[PDB]
C-alpha cells in the first residue's frame, strides 16, 4: 500500500531497527561503571592497572573498556570537568556501580566522606551502588604504624572505635593498621547505611597502588548488584 | 469427598478470574513487559488451562459415560486435555524457577536468550510428553475412557516429567533460598527470608513436594485437600502475590487511573 | 582594591536594581487580568517514538517540523520521521555520554556533545550511505550542555566550563567566547533574528549575548536555583527561565527585569525544559517529576499537564510550525503531543 | 592581580548593564500580549487544528 | 538575586568565642539546607557544618563536633555558626554556603573552588 518512497522508508528504518537490536544486546551486556575520586586516589593507578591487565586534550571523560570472564565493563573517568559535578553526575543515573575511591592514608579523607554522602545521597545516584575502594592501604600502614599523625586527631570517634569482629584483617598486619583501616570503612559505612534504605549498597574494599584482584572485586559486586536488582524485581529482597 | 469437589472447583473458578484479570494487566501495561511479566503471564494462562481442563474432564467423565450417548471420544480428549494442562502447570512452574536462577547466575544481564529456550520448552515438552502418552494409549491399553492412569508402562510418561519437573524445581528453590541467605548475611532480615520463601512456595509449587516421589496411595488423604483443594487456589494466590502485591504492577495501575 | 571594586560593584547592582523598579510600573499579572484564559489545554501523545535504549538527554526539532533528532546516552543520534515514526538515521556517537543535539536549520547537519567535551558535527547528506562526523569542536574545557546552529557554518555552544562559544565549523575554531557567566551553562536558545541568544546557567543567571559583538549586553538575576532550560519568545523581546527551583520566569530583554514567575506549590521538581508554543501563549515546562506542564505565558496559571512520561522529562521542543510538542524523557521514550479541535 | 582583573571586568560589565534604555513593563507587557493576539489563530497548540490538517492525525 | 552576606567573624583570642551570622537575600531560605564552609589559608576549601531545611538534622565535621554549633533562623532568613572555643586551626575565611536545589540533601559543590550560592566570606583569625 506504500508508496515506494514510503517503501524505502520503512526498509530504512527496519535497517535500522535491526542494527539497533544488535546495539542493544551489546549495549545491554556491558556493565557501564563511573569510576570518581579525588586527586589524590589512585584511580589513575586502577585504570592504568586494567587497561594493561585487559583488553584531544579537553576530553572531559575518559572510557577504559576491561573485561573479566565474559562480562564486559566500560569504566568511565571524569577528567576534564570542573570541579562543580551536581550536573554532569547526572548522565550517570544508569550505571551499574559508581567505584568510589578514597585515599585512606590521607586524612583528608574527610572530603572523601562529604563526597561519598553527596554522591550516596542524590536524588539521581540513589538506586546506584558503590564500589567504595579504600586504596592506598600500604600508604595507610606506613602512616599508622609511623604514629607522626594520628586519627583521633582528625576524627575524635577513633579514641573510642573498636575494630569489630567481622573484621578479616591479612595475616601479617598490625591490629592498629586493622584498626585504622575498619574505622575509615566504617565511616563510610555509616554514610551508607544512614539512607540507602536497601535501595542501593556500598561495597568497601581494601585495596593498594596496584593490585591485580581489583577487576575480580568489581566482578564480583557487579555480580552482586545485579543478583540484587533481579531479587528486588521479583519482590524477593 | 464431595467438600473436595466444593473446594477445588470454586477456588478454580477464583483462580480463573483472577489470572484473566492478571494477565489482561501484564499484557496491557506495556512497561511491564519485561520478560519476567511473560514468564509469570505464561504461568498464569497455565493455571487457566489446569483450571479448564479439569472442568472439562470432570464435566465429560460425569456426562459422556453415561448420560450423553456417540460422546465417547470427547472423554478420552478430555483427559489429554487435562494431562497437557497439568504438565504446562508443573513446566512453567519449573521454568519460572530456571529463569529466576539463570537471571542470578548468568553473568550479563542479557539472558533473554534463555527467556525463548524457556518458552520452547515450558510448551513443546508438554506437547511433546502428551503426544507420547496418546500415541501409547493408542497403541497399547486402549481403554474406552483414557483415565484408567494404571497402565505403568504409559503412564509415566506424564507422570515421570511431573516428578522430575517437582524435584528439579526443589532444587532450584533451595539454591534461590542460598543466594537469598548469603544476600542477606539480623531480626528483620530473618522476617524477609520467611516473606520471600512464602512467595516462592507458590510460585514453584514447592507444596507438591510433599507428595511427588511417593507413591499415589501414600498420604492420599492429605495429599488430595493440599494437591487437589489448595492446588486449585494456588493460581488465585500466585495472582494475587506476583501481579496485584507487585510495586511496579500497582504503580502502573496508579499513574493509568 | 578588590573592597572599593566590590562596594563599587554593590553600588553598580543597587543603581541596575533601582533602575528595573522604575520600569515596574504594572506587573503581567495585572495587565493579563482581563484577557480571557487559555483553557484546559488536553493533548494527546499522538507518537511515541521508541527506539532509544538508554534516557533521552536532548531533543531538536528540523525547521520542517517533520524530522526529530534525539540524544540518547547509549551513544546513538536518532533521526525520527514524526510522521511515520520512521528512524531516517542512527548515528553511532564516538562518546555515549552526549547531553545536547543540534538540527541545523538546513537539515543538512546534526551536532551533538556532551562530558567529551566535544560538539560533534554530523553531515547528513553525504554521497556514502551513512552519516560521518564532519568536524568535532574540541576546545571546551567543560561538558557540552546545549548547542544551536546559527547555519550551517556556525555553531553556538554551551559548557560546563562557565562559557559559550561560537564556532566556526569550517574552520573548527572558536570565532568567539562568551565569558561573563560564573557558573555551569545549561542552556541556549537563539532569538529568532539568530542576532542575540540568552544562556542560563548553574549561576542562577541568565544573560543574553550579541553573537557578533561577544558580549553580554544583560543579565537576569530573578532565578533562586540553577537556570536548566531557556527559551526564548517568539517575538525576540523576552524569554523564559526553567529552574532548579521549580519555577519558570519570564524575562523582558527591555524591561531588563521579570515579567512573570510560574509556580505552583505542588510543584517541588525542577524544570528540566522549558519551550513557547508558536503564539507564545503557552509556556511548556518538563519536570524532574515526570510531567509536563503547559502554563498560561500571560497569566501564569497551568493550562494543563502532559502526564504521559514514566520518568524525568528531559527535552521538550515545540515544532517551528508549531503542530506538535515532543517530549523526550529519561524513559528512553520520546512521545510527540498535540491537541485536538 | 587574578582577582583585580576579574572585579574590574565585573564593574565595567555592570556599567554597560547600567547604562541600558529600558522600557516600562508595562510596555513590554503590551507588547507580548499584542503578540500572543495576533498569532493566537497562527498556533494549532492554543487552538488544535481539524484532525484533517494535524499530520500526527491517528 | 541570590546573595549571602557573612558576619560577625573577626580577630580573636585564642579559645574565644565568636557567633558568625549570614544574612540569606533572594531565595526561599527555609527550602534549602544550609552549609558553613571555609578556606584556611595555608589549604583548599574546606565544608565544616550543614544544616537542614528545619534544622532536624544538623551534621560537623570532627575538628568542629563539640566546638561550634550551626543554626538557622528560618524566620529572619539567617544562618548562624556558635564558634565556641575557637583554635588556631579555625583561622579561616568562612562561608556561608547554600545547597543548590530546594527540597533536597545532595550537597553537591559547596566546596568547590568556585559555586554560585556562597557568600564572600568572613575571615576569622584566632
Redesign the interface.
Not at chain 1, 140 to 147: D, F, N, R, T
Not at chain 2, 94 to 112: D, K, W
Given at each position: 500500500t506504500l508508496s515506494a518512497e514510503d517503501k524505502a522508508a520503512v526498509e530504512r528504518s527496519k535497517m535500522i531497527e535491526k542494527q539497533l537490536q544488535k546495539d542493544k544486546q551489546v549495549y545491554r551486556a556491558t556493565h557501564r561503571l563511573l569510576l570518581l575520586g579525588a586527586d589524590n586516589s589512585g584511580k589513575s593507578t586502577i585504570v592504568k592497572q586494567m587497561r594493561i591487565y585487559h583488553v584531544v586534550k579537553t576530553s572531559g571523560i575518559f572510557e577504559t573498556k576491561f573485561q573479566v570472564d565474559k562480562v564486559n565493563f566500560h569504566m568511565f573517568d571524569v577528567g576534564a570537568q570542573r570541579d562543580e559535578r551536581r550536573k554532569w553526575i547526572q548522565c550517570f543515573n544508569d550505571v551499574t556501580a559508581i567505584i568510589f575511591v578514597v585515599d585512606s592514608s590521607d586524612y583528608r579523607l574527610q572530603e572523601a566522606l562529604n563526597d561519598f554522602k553527596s554522591i550516596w545521597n542524590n536524588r539521581w545516584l540513589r538506586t546506584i551502588s558503590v564500589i567504595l575502594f579504600l586504596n592506598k592501604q600500604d600508604l595507610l600502614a606506613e602512616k599508622v604504624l609511623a604514629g607522626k599523625s594520628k586519627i583521633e586527631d582528625y576524627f575524635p570517634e577513633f579514641a573510642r572505635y573498636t575494630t569489630p569482629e567481622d573484621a578479616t584483617p591479612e595475616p601479617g598486619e598490625d591490629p592498629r593498621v586493622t584498626r585504622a583501616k575498619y574505622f575509615i570503612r566504617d565511616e563510610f559505612l555509616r554514610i551508607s547505611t544512614a539512607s540507602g534504605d536497601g535501595r542501593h549498597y556500598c561495597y568497601p574494599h581494601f585495596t593498594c597502588s596496584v593490585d591485580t584482584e581489583n577487576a575480580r572485586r568489581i566482578f564480583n559486586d557487579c555480580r552482586d548488584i545485579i543478583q540484587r536488582m533481579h531479587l528486588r524485581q521479583y519482590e524477593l529482597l | 469427598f464431595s467438600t473436595v469437589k466444593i473446594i477445588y472447583t470454586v477456588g478454580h473458578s477464583i483462580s480463573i478470574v483472577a489470572l484473566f484479570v492478571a494477565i489482561t494487566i501484564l499484557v496491557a501495561l506495556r512497561?511491564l513487559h519485561?520478560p519476567?511479566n511473560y514468564v509469570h503471564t505464561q504461568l498464569f494462562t497455565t493455571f487457566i488451562l489446569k483450571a479448564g481442563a479439569v472442568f472439562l474432564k470432570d464435566a465429560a467423565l460425569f456426562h459422556s459415560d453415561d448420560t450423553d450417548h456417540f460422546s465417547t471420544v470427547l472423554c478420552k480428549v478430555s483427559v489429554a486435555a487435562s494431562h497437557f494442562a497439568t504438565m504446562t502447570n508443573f513446566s512453567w512452574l519449573l521454568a519460572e524457577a530456571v529463569y529466576?536462577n539463570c537471571?542470578?547466575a548468568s553473568?550479563?544481564?542479557?539472558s533473554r536468550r534463555a527467556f525463548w529456550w524457556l518458552v520452547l520448552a515450558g510448551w513443546g515438552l508438554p506437547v511433546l510428553f502428551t503426544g507420547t502418552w496418546v500415541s501409547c494409549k493408542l497403541a497399547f491399553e486402549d481403554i474406552a475412557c483414557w483415565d484408567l492412569d494404571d497402565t505403568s508402562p504409559y503412564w509415566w510418561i506424564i507422570k515421570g516429567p511431573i516428578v522430575l519437573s517437582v524435584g528439579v524445581n526443589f532444587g532450584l528453590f533451595l539454591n534461590?533460598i542460598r543466594?537469598?541467605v548469603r544476600?542477606?548475611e539480623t531480626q528483620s532480615q530473618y522476617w524477609?527470608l520467611s516473606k520471600?520463601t512464602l512467595?516462592?512456595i507458590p510460585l514453584f509449587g514447592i507444596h507438591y513436594i510433599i507428595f511427588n516421589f511417593l507413591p499415589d496411595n501414600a498420604g492420599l488423604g492429605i495429599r488430595l485437600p493440599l494437591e487437589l483443594g489448595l492446588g486449585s487456589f494456588q493460581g488465585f494466590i500466585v495472582a494475587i502475590?506476583?501481579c496485584f502485591?507487585?510495586?511496579?504492577v500497582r504503580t502502573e495501575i496508579s499513574?493509568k487511573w | 582594591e578588590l573592597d572599593q571594586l566590590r562596594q563599587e560593584a554593590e553600588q553598580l547592582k543597587n543603581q541596575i536594581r533601582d533602575a528595573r523598579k522604575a520600569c515596574a510600573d504594572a506587573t503581567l499579572s495585572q495587565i493579563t487580568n482581563n484577557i480571557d484564559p487559555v483553557g484546559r489545554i488536553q493533548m494527546r501523545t499522538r507518537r511515541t517514538l521508541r527506539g532509544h535504549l538508554a534516557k533521552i538527554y536532548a531533543m531538536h526539532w528540523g525547521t520542517d517540523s517533520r524530522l526529530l533528532v534525539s540524544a540518547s546516552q547509549d551513544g546513538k543520534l536518532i533521526i525520527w520521521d514524526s510522521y511515520t515514526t520512521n528512524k531516517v538515521h542512527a548515528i553511532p556517537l564516538r562518546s555515549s555520554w552526549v547531553m545536547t543535539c543540534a538540527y541545523a536549520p538546513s537539515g543538512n547537519y546534526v551536532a551533538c556533545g556532551g562530558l567529551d567535551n566535544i560538539c560533534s558535527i554530523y553531515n547528513l547528506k553525504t554521497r556514502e550511505g551513512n552519516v560521518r562526523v564532519s568536524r568535532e569542536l574540541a576546545g571546551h574545557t567543560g561538558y557540552l550542555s546545549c548547542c544551536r546552529f546559527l547555519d550551517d557554518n556556525q555553531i553556538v555552544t554551551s559548557s560546563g566550563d562557565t562559557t559559550c562559544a561560537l564556532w566556526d565549523i569550517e574552520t573548527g575554531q572558536q570565532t568567539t567566547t562568551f565569558t561573563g557567566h560564573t557558573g555551569d551553562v545549561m542552556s541556549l536558545s537563539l532569538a529568532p533574528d539568530t542576532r542575540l541568544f540568552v544562556s542560563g546557567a548553574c549561576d542562577a543567571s541568565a544573560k543574553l549575548w550579541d553573537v557578533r559583538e561577544g558580549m553580554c549586553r544583560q543579565t537576569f538575576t530573578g532565578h533562586e536555583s540553577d537556570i536548566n532550560a531557556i527559551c526564548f519568545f517568539p517575538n525576540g523581546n523576552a524569554f523564559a527561565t526553567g529552574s532548579d527551583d521549580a519555577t519558570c520566569r519570564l524575562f523582558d530583554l527591555r524591561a531588563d527585569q521579570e515579567l512573570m514567575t510560574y509556580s505552583h506549590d505542588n510543584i517541588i521538581c525542577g524544570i528540566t525544559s522549558v519551550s513557547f508554543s508558536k503564539s507564545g501563549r503557552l509556556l511548556l515546562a518538563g519536570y524532574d517529576d515526570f510531567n509536563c506542564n503547559v502554563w498560561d505565558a500571560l497569566k501564569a496559571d497551568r493550562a494543563g499537564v502532559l502526564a504521559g512520561h514514566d520518568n524525568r522529562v528531559s527535552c521538550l521542543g515545540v515544532t517551528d510550525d508549531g503542530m506538535a510538542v515532543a517530549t523526550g524523557s529519561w524513559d528512553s521514550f520520546l512521545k510527540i503531543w498535540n491537541g485536538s479541535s | 592581580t587574578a582577582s583585580i582583573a576579574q572585579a574590574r571586568k565585573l564593574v565595567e560589565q555592570l556599567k554597560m548593564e547600567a547604562n541600558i534604555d529600558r522600557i516600562k513593563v508595562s510596555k513590554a507587557a503590551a507588547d507580548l500580549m499584542a503578540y500572543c493576539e495576533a498569532h493566537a489563530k497562527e498556533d494549532p497548540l492554543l487552538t488544535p487544528v481539524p484532525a484533517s490538517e494535524n499530520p500526527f492525525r491517528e | 538575586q541570590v546573595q549571602l552576606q557573612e558576619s560577625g567573624g573577626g580577630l580573636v583570642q585564642p579559645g574565644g568565642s565568636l557567633r558568625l551570622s549570614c544574612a540569606a537575600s533572594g531565595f526561599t531560605f527555609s527550602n534549602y539546607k544550609m552549609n558553613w564552609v571555609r578556606q584556611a589559608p595555608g589549604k583548599g576549601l574546606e565544608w565544616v557544618s550543614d544544616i537542614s531545611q528545619s534544622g532536624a538534622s544538623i551534621s560537623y565535621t570532627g575538628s568542629v563536633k563539640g566546638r561550634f554549633t550551626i543554626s538557622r533562623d528560618n524566620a529572619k532568613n539567617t544562618l548562624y555558626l556558635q564558634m565556641n572555643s575557637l583554635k588556631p586551626e579555625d583561622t579561616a575565611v568562612y562561608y556561608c554556603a547554600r545547597c543548590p536545589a530546594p527540597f533536597t540533601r545532595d550537597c553537591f559543590d559547596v566546596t568547590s573552588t568556585t559555586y554560585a550560592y556562597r557568600g564572600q566570606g568572613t575571615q576569622v583569625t584566632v
Amino acid at each position: 500500500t506504500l508508496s515506494a518512497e514510503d517503501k524505502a522508508a520503512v526498509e530504512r528504518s527496519k535497517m535500522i531497527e535491526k542494527q539497533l537490536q544488535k546495539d542493544k544486546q551489546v549495549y545491554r551486556a556491558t556493565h557501564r561503571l563511573l569510576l570518581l575520586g579525588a586527586d589524590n586516589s589512585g584511580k589513575s593507578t586502577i585504570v592504568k592497572q586494567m587497561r594493561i591487565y585487559h583488553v584531544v586534550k579537553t576530553s572531559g571523560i575518559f572510557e577504559t573498556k576491561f573485561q573479566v570472564d565474559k562480562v564486559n565493563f566500560h569504566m568511565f573517568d571524569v577528567g576534564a570537568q570542573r570541579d562543580e559535578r551536581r550536573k554532569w553526575i547526572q548522565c550517570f543515573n544508569d550505571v551499574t556501580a559508581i567505584i568510589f575511591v578514597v585515599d585512606s592514608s590521607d586524612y583528608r579523607l574527610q572530603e572523601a566522606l562529604n563526597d561519598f554522602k553527596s554522591i550516596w545521597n542524590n536524588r539521581w545516584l540513589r538506586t546506584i551502588s558503590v564500589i567504595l575502594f579504600l586504596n592506598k592501604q600500604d600508604l595507610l600502614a606506613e602512616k599508622v604504624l609511623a604514629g607522626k599523625s594520628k586519627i583521633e586527631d582528625y576524627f575524635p570517634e577513633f579514641a573510642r572505635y573498636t575494630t569489630p569482629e567481622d573484621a578479616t584483617p591479612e595475616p601479617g598486619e598490625d591490629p592498629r593498621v586493622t584498626r585504622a583501616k575498619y574505622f575509615i570503612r566504617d565511616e563510610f559505612l555509616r554514610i551508607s547505611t544512614a539512607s540507602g534504605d536497601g535501595r542501593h549498597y556500598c561495597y568497601p574494599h581494601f585495596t593498594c597502588s596496584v593490585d591485580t584482584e581489583n577487576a575480580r572485586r568489581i566482578f564480583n559486586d557487579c555480580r552482586d548488584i545485579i543478583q540484587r536488582m533481579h531479587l528486588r524485581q521479583y519482590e524477593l529482597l | 469427598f464431595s467438600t473436595v469437589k466444593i473446594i477445588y472447583t470454586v477456588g478454580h473458578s477464583i483462580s480463573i478470574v483472577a489470572l484473566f484479570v492478571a494477565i489482561t494487566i501484564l499484557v496491557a501495561l506495556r512497561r511491564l513487559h519485561c520478560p519476567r511479566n511473560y514468564v509469570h503471564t505464561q504461568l498464569f494462562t497455565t493455571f487457566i488451562l489446569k483450571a479448564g481442563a479439569v472442568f472439562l474432564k470432570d464435566a465429560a467423565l460425569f456426562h459422556s459415560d453415561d448420560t450423553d450417548h456417540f460422546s465417547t471420544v470427547l472423554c478420552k480428549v478430555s483427559v489429554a486435555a487435562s494431562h497437557f494442562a497439568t504438565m504446562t502447570n508443573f513446566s512453567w512452574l519449573l521454568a519460572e524457577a530456571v529463569y529466576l536462577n539463570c537471571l542470578l547466575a548468568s553473568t550479563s544481564p542479557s539472558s533473554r536468550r534463555a527467556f525463548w529456550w524457556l518458552v520452547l520448552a515450558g510448551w513443546g515438552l508438554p506437547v511433546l510428553f502428551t503426544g507420547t502418552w496418546v500415541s501409547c494409549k493408542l497403541a497399547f491399553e486402549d481403554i474406552a475412557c483414557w483415565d484408567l492412569d494404571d497402565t505403568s508402562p504409559y503412564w509415566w510418561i506424564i507422570k515421570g516429567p511431573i516428578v522430575l519437573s517437582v524435584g528439579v524445581n526443589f532444587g532450584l528453590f533451595l539454591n534461590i533460598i542460598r543466594i537469598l541467605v548469603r544476600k542477606l548475611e539480623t531480626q528483620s532480615q530473618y522476617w524477609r527470608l520467611s516473606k520471600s520463601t512464602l512467595f516462592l512456595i507458590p510460585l514453584f509449587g514447592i507444596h507438591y513436594i510433599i507428595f511427588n516421589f511417593l507413591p499415589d496411595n501414600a498420604g492420599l488423604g492429605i495429599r488430595l485437600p493440599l494437591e487437589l483443594g489448595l492446588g486449585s487456589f494456588q493460581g488465585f494466590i500466585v495472582a494475587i502475590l506476583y501481579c496485584f502485591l507487585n510495586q511496579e504492577v500497582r504503580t502502573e495501575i496508579s499513574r493509568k487511573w | 582594591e578588590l573592597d572599593q571594586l566590590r562596594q563599587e560593584a554593590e553600588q553598580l547592582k543597587n543603581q541596575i536594581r533601582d533602575a528595573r523598579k522604575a520600569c515596574a510600573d504594572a506587573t503581567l499579572s495585572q495587565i493579563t487580568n482581563n484577557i480571557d484564559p487559555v483553557g484546559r489545554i488536553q493533548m494527546r501523545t499522538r507518537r511515541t517514538l521508541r527506539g532509544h535504549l538508554a534516557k533521552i538527554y536532548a531533543m531538536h526539532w528540523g525547521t520542517d517540523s517533520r524530522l526529530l533528532v534525539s540524544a540518547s546516552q547509549d551513544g546513538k543520534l536518532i533521526i525520527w520521521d514524526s510522521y511515520t515514526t520512521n528512524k531516517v538515521h542512527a548515528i553511532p556517537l564516538r562518546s555515549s555520554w552526549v547531553m545536547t543535539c543540534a538540527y541545523a536549520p538546513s537539515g543538512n547537519y546534526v551536532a551533538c556533545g556532551g562530558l567529551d567535551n566535544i560538539c560533534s558535527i554530523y553531515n547528513l547528506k553525504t554521497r556514502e550511505g551513512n552519516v560521518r562526523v564532519s568536524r568535532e569542536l574540541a576546545g571546551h574545557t567543560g561538558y557540552l550542555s546545549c548547542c544551536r546552529f546559527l547555519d550551517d557554518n556556525q555553531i553556538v555552544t554551551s559548557s560546563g566550563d562557565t562559557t559559550c562559544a561560537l564556532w566556526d565549523i569550517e574552520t573548527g575554531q572558536q570565532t568567539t567566547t562568551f565569558t561573563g557567566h560564573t557558573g555551569d551553562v545549561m542552556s541556549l536558545s537563539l532569538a529568532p533574528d539568530t542576532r542575540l541568544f540568552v544562556s542560563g546557567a548553574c549561576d542562577a543567571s541568565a544573560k543574553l549575548w550579541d553573537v557578533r559583538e561577544g558580549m553580554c549586553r544583560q543579565t537576569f538575576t530573578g532565578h533562586e536555583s540553577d537556570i536548566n532550560a531557556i527559551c526564548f519568545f517568539p517575538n525576540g523581546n523576552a524569554f523564559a527561565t526553567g529552574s532548579d527551583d521549580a519555577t519558570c520566569r519570564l524575562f523582558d530583554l527591555r524591561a531588563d527585569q521579570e515579567l512573570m514567575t510560574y509556580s505552583h506549590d505542588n510543584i517541588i521538581c525542577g524544570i528540566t525544559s522549558v519551550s513557547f508554543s508558536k503564539s507564545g501563549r503557552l509556556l511548556l515546562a518538563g519536570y524532574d517529576d515526570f510531567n509536563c506542564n503547559v502554563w498560561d505565558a500571560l497569566k501564569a496559571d497551568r493550562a494543563g499537564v502532559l502526564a504521559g512520561h514514566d520518568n524525568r522529562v528531559s527535552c521538550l521542543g515545540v515544532t517551528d510550525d508549531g503542530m506538535a510538542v515532543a517530549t523526550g524523557s529519561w524513559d528512553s521514550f520520546l512521545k510527540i503531543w498535540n491537541g485536538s479541535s | 592581580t587574578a582577582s583585580i582583573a576579574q572585579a574590574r571586568k565585573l564593574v565595567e560589565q555592570l556599567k554597560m548593564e547600567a547604562n541600558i534604555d529600558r522600557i516600562k513593563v508595562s510596555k513590554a507587557a503590551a507588547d507580548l500580549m499584542a503578540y500572543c493576539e495576533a498569532h493566537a489563530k497562527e498556533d494549532p497548540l492554543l487552538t488544535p487544528v481539524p484532525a484533517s490538517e494535524n499530520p500526527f492525525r491517528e | 538575586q541570590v546573595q549571602l552576606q557573612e558576619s560577625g567573624g573577626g580577630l580573636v583570642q585564642p579559645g574565644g568565642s565568636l557567633r558568625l551570622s549570614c544574612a540569606a537575600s533572594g531565595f526561599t531560605f527555609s527550602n534549602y539546607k544550609m552549609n558553613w564552609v571555609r578556606q584556611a589559608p595555608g589549604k583548599g576549601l574546606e565544608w565544616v557544618s550543614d544544616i537542614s531545611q528545619s534544622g532536624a538534622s544538623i551534621s560537623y565535621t570532627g575538628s568542629v563536633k563539640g566546638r561550634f554549633t550551626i543554626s538557622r533562623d528560618n524566620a529572619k532568613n539567617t544562618l548562624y555558626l556558635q564558634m565556641n572555643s575557637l583554635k588556631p586551626e579555625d583561622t579561616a575565611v568562612y562561608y556561608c554556603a547554600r545547597c543548590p536545589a530546594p527540597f533536597t540533601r545532595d550537597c553537591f559543590d559547596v566546596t568547590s573552588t568556585t559555586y554560585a550560592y556562597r557568600g564572600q566570606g568572613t575571615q576569622v583569625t584566632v
